[PDB]
Amino acid sequence: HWGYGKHNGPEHWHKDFPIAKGERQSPVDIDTHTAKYDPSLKPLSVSYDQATSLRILNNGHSFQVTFDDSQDKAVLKGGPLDGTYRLLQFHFHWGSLDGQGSEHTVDKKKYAAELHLVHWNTKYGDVGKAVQQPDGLAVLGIFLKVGSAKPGLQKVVDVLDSIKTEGKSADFTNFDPRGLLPESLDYWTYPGSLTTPPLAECVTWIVLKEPISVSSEQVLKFRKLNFNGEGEPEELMVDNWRPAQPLKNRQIKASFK
Numbered sequence: 601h602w603g604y605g606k607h608n609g610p611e612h613w614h615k616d617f618p619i620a621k622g623e624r625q626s627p628v629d630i631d632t633h634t635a636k637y638d639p640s641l642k643p644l645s646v647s648y649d650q651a652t653s654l655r656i657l658n659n660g661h662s663f664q665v666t667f668d669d670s671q672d673k674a675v676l677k678g679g680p681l682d683g684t685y686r687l688l689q690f691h692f693h694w695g696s697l698d699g700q701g702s703e704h705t706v707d708k709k710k711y712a713a714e715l716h717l718v719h720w721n722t723k724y725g726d727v728g729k730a731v732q733q734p735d736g737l738a739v740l741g742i743f744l745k746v747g748s749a750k751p752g753l754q755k756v757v758d759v760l761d762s763i764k765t766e767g768k769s770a771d772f773t774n775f776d777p778r779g780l781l782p783e784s785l786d787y788w789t790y791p792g793s794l795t796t797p798p799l800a801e802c803v804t805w806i807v808l809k810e811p812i813s814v815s816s817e818q819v820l821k822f823r824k825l826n827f828n829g830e831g832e833p834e835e836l837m838v839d840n841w842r843p844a845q846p847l848k849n850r851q852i853k854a855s856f857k
């Protein structure tokens with residue numbers, strides 16, 4: 601089974617998931633000077649006031665906070681999107697040290713971590729169907745740098761000791777994802793893929809220009825998680841990021857000048 605190690609990591613994934621070498625794979629390096637400002641791009645609409653978080657889960661690749669996506673309660677619209685996308689979950693990718701951990705890079709710069717808020721297009725009814733469509737998913741990506749703490753992240757950090765190993769979950773109600781967002785919704789966008797298996801080419805990527813700051817203590821708690829199940833040899837859940845993939849025939853567009 602796939603992972604991030606020498607023998608099962610990103611360079612191996614194409615054997616089980618041949619689309620790994622496809623034409624619209626993610627993440628990519630965002631070359632800020634080559635991205636074209638598109639004045640026709642709308643502001644992104646993030647409507648998270650009625651979000652209902654349910655659970656927090658160590659899924660063996662990351663940890664995730666899952667939401668009730670059975671109604672239009674936490675939705676993404678506008679920006680480069682046509683229609684309404686429901687928030688299913690958010691999760692992170694991070695490094696063993698602060699100089700790596702993001703999936704997208706900005707002029708080759710790696711951030712300490714990257715937050716993904718995963719949304720699916722309501723016209724397809726469920727996430728399984730949406731992943732089979734070229735406009736099925738919209739993932740909002742936010743970079744994390746290390747400095748000042750992010751107060752809105754602390755409730756997440758504080759429960760990670762209860763989900764150390766793969767398969768563990770906990771109740772995680774009343775979490776407000778608005779507390780993870782930077783000031784600006786200026787973004788880059790491009791057509792891409794899931795960055796984990798099955799690597800489906802179903803994602804409109806929306807990557808915010810402004811990182812959030814988190815503290816060293818907050819990111820250190822991420823690094824105490826385990827890839828392994830309880831009872832198996834302990835392998836720290838660190839460096840759970842796919843490297844930048846070839847841009848090929850794609851244009852990255854910017855919402856801002």
Ligand SMILES: [N]S(=O)(=O)[C][C][C]C1234B567B89%10B%11%12%13B85%14B%1158B%12%11%15B9%13%12B%1061B%12%112C5%153([C][C][C]S([N])(=O)=O)B%14784
Nearest residue numbers: 689716718727731739793794795796797798
């Ligand atoms: N094939 S597997 O081993 O079951 C991993 C499945 C991963 C996901 B399921 B469905 B939706 B949810 B969430 B998205 B898609 B598929 B993809 C997911 C992960 C974020 C992929 S990322 N990093 O945001 O591109 B979970």
Ligand SMILES: [Zn+2]
Nearest residue numbers: 691693716795
């Ligand atoms: Zn992700």
